[PDB]
Symmetry: none
Subunit: 345 residues, 4 copies
């Protein structure tokens, strides 16, 4: 009887909360952000006025939540509908690379050596890729290594090699860039800039990639949560570049039977939450040659936008992932199985 | 020149190591095991005779390895070729349940409620399963719960309900048994005894299941390694029962977007290492209704021997997994998608 | 600006008064609120704000777990062989991983008694990853432990692995241990909860704090409140150690529950070289006890051969504890 | 039995003599050995045994990492603002999570100086999960920190997030911090290795010990050996804490490397109620220092609002450290 009226005190709060929120954004316009001093000044006034029944600490918590809500109204704050989210843009993003519309429903395959070692080595792989009618190649010029004494990659010379081979065999180049200063130079040699797992939270590198007009392949961090992975993509897109391809490549767990644990569920999670295409790297996730094909099949069936695997003409002598890379005859058998699976329309 | 002869000291060691190994097994026959006292007595004699160049600690380590190797020669020790391994038996194990040869290459599907709540509730699910031409049903009479105050299951009465419904609708029953004393009673009510994730290393329960003639569905532990999972299956098979179906159901990781992380790579790993069929539980791994179908598709494409998912006539009122279980119309849509996928031959 | 700011400040006061008045009165409903939402916030934000407002109401306005301090504020003290575990003075539990023979266990017992210590741990039933590794002597092992207990005056802690063995164990042990792999063997927990005997409950390989507390509740809900919790490391990606000792579990559990908390330094780290440092950390963080393994001839042990301290190593370890002034 | 046993015993001696003689001589090859295998062991076992025999040979028969004790046995001491970090006396580093203003940082500095402490930590560049959360004041923040350092006489520790900023930072900080998320930002590590300035390297979110050591090696391989390692918790399934403080990392790193090792108790646990207990554990396990956050008004802080101690809380925390006798 009396608690029917407490129902209208709710309509009064909504009106009050909404009106206040509008005024605060007006103050933002008249001026031009975080202001802890103003927040404390507001809290002092509110708490001084508290006559109960709530204790000061409870009142402070409630108002903080109200203030926090206001931040999302800011033009530049997309916390409530991330630019990379379907909440922001419902339609799938198509990232076109060498005429291939990545994300359009037809899966793409990216093969290539772990590390660029020589012109002849990359050419041998490009020849086998072209022979299958494929159009992309991946190759590491800059290699993130656990130890500084392991092969770091050929650097710029590796990118030059990749460009030479690609220009001749008609392939698009995907290669990793490891520091902000190298992004500008990379534009003349690659078709897609890869940001590696270990750099997924190298924020200045993400921002740098967000300021150029070039597709970015962002690999999930070794132990990144889906939220963090989406957040990293937002760093790129918030600078202007929306041409982002996400890549699942396994996460770190207690399991020793595999190098990492392929998190296949990330594909449908990311395709639901974001509008960005999602690929799966079957080589670096499992770290096992005998699992490349089964994992590739799982990836395609779960509707990944693409699959990446490593191929090297003589894996025995490779400067990285010697036991994981497929040789040319193995690559032929792998591809014949993919062709026979009917998983690619 | 002189190190060509050190090559023949190798042939002498093999002969000596082999002859010794044979004598020790003869001692085992003449007698009838672990004997730390004899090991120390042997080590005292060996170390007393050490004139170098190795230090006593190094000599002790080498002989321990030699002694350790001898253990595998014991008849009852299968450490080097586990009974569940392909090294022991190359051919796939087929586990026949209600006329279905699980493991023969044709995937099977197991649907049913998380918990058995009443005759009518289970019957409603059995009716939808039978309508699709399916032949198995799963239902929890004993429910392992984090809190003792959550619904523990109906117990024996739940098994009686399952039997009644199954006998009428022609379905085979899969249900979890949680303690050794309950295995004997279960034989009259179930077609497959399930050992849950939390009991994967309840060894006395495994041994008890190994002493009866009834198919066992062994779920992988929350954080079990593949080695531990295979070891658990060996506890069952070492007692005589080789009718074991392995079930991947996700592993515990830092990720919060899912309840557990489905480890899809476990399927091809287990199918390579062992001769046992392997199923995937898509409900308990992801803990998310929107991921059941994608995960089921991945499971089938990676050649799992079966898929398990939960169905409840009114999930809102369910006593467990209320948000994860599919209702009857959802189950129809799920099944129609499976039928349309061509992933089941 | 001053103008708009003073209006915002007045609106702030209006909200306080409006919120508190409503609270006084209140002292399903979101459906009608959202219907009146006309911006600038989206429905989800509006809803999140009112839920915080309703939650506040439960400030000054019986389902506590039995093992929680909410249920019982005072510390639980479990007295074993005369030692009041949980009273503020840490206890030390040493002993071999596996019971292998009477002579072996007696050698460790002698060394324990020599230090004025009163407890011994020894495994008669050993859970093993592989069925082909030593499984324990079983009942014979319990009988050995009871003989040693009668002879050396030490209280025995030993693992029980199945519900039926709980009743059998009562005649042989002073504390029943439930191993990490059985932390969610719920029928075993209920069996342990039905007897009048202290239980040492080890955290599961990957058990959360909530799950560990829940497991203890299974035991106490059957009637047995003499429960000692044991942190023994958690499973992680790190390979330098067997498990990752989670030292933070001690103060967390001491705050949330009234149960004593011990730390097993051998099974957590799996490294002899880390036993002393981890024992010092456990004592400093106020654990109620430390457990470590000691064997007269570790090289030939049937379990944890590289992790167990021999008798001379045990003497050095103990002398270091006495010199640390951490007790 | 006696008969067969004495033969086995003689065969044992024959192996010792045969093995040692071969070793004396030795002082690809498995291919020929297996060819002669005729049982009872399978080839895999035979091969595993000879590999152990060949390995032994490398007993009494230059590629050590620069950061390893194998390279340099003596402890590295890093002196900052007159304090010799790593000399056996633990140091304490307090300060706010983010630099928000001069007045804010100065308030904490005053409290630090009042205790006779000499270091302060403050983030001018803040790595954040979301690009919409406060990113730090940047260069302005470094300038504030240097002003406070000149005024209160404290050495400044602050995070640098990109290679270009390493050189800029030299004029403002006494120690450059490399954050957990950048532990494998290899170009940043190399940049830090090319300057003459102490570096505080935080363990990555899920970095292994090996990886952490490797990261330190990137720095030292460029010439800079003034590296302080910082354990700050590792990512696990546990939700009761932000991260799992891995206390075992301290003695492991102190044994493997010659570099000092600190523990950040705020970022590991993410819980104000665990700061003191974890600091006591870190001191007892012999960490070279402890780091914790202090803010004059945590409720309004732009990062870690619930984790930072206010000034009165900092006083209680410090008084407890002084009363513990753990220093
Ligand atoms: Mn690679
Ligand atoms: Mn369920
Ligand atoms: Mn042990
Ligand atoms: Mn902080």
């Amino acid at each position: 009887e009396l608690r029917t009226q407490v129902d209208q005190l709710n309509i009064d709060l909504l009106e009050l909360i909404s009106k206040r929120a509008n005024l605060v954004q007006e103050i933002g316009k008249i001026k031009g952000r975080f202001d802890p001093l103003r927040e404390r000044e507001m809290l002092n006034t509110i708490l001084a006025a508290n006559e109960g029944p709530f204790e000061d600490s409870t009142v402070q918590k409630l108002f903080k939540e109200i203030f926090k809500a206001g931040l999302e109204l800011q033009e530049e704050d997309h916390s409530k509908a991330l630019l990379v989210s379907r909440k922001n843009k419902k339609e799938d993003t198509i990232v076109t690379v060498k005429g291939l519309p990545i994300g359009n429903g037809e899966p793409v395959f990216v093969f290539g050596p772990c590390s660029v070692e020589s012109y002849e080595q990359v050419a041998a792989v490009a020849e086998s890729i072209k022979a299958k009618g494929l159009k992309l190649i991946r190759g590491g010029a800059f290699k993130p290594r656990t130890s500084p004494y392991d092969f770091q990659g050929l650097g710029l010379e590796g990118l030059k090699i990749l460009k030479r081979v690609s220009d001749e065999y008609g392939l698009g180049v995907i290669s990793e860039i490891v520091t902000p200063a190298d992004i500008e130079v990379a534009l003349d040699y690659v078709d897609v800039i890869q940001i590696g797992a270990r750099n997924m939270q190298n924020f200045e590198l993400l921002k740098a990639a967000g300021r150029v007009d070039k597709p970015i392949l962002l690999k999930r961090g070794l132990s990144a949560t889906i939220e963090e992975f989406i957040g990293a993509a937002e760093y790129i897109m918030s600078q202007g570049n929306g041409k982002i391809i996400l890549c699942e490549r396994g996460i770190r767990t207690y399991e020793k039977a595999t190098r990492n644990t392929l998190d296949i569920s990330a594909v449908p999670i990311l395709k639901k939450e974001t509008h960005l295409p999602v690929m799966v790297d079957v080589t670096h996730s499992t770290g096992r040659k005998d699992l490349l094909l089964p994992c590739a099949k799982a990836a395609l069936a779960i509707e990944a936008d693409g699959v990446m695997a490593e191929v090297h003409p003589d894996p025995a002598v490779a400067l990285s992932d010697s036991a994981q890379q497929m040789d040319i005859p193995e690559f032929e058998e792998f591809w014949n199985a993919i062709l026979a699976s009917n998983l690619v329309p």
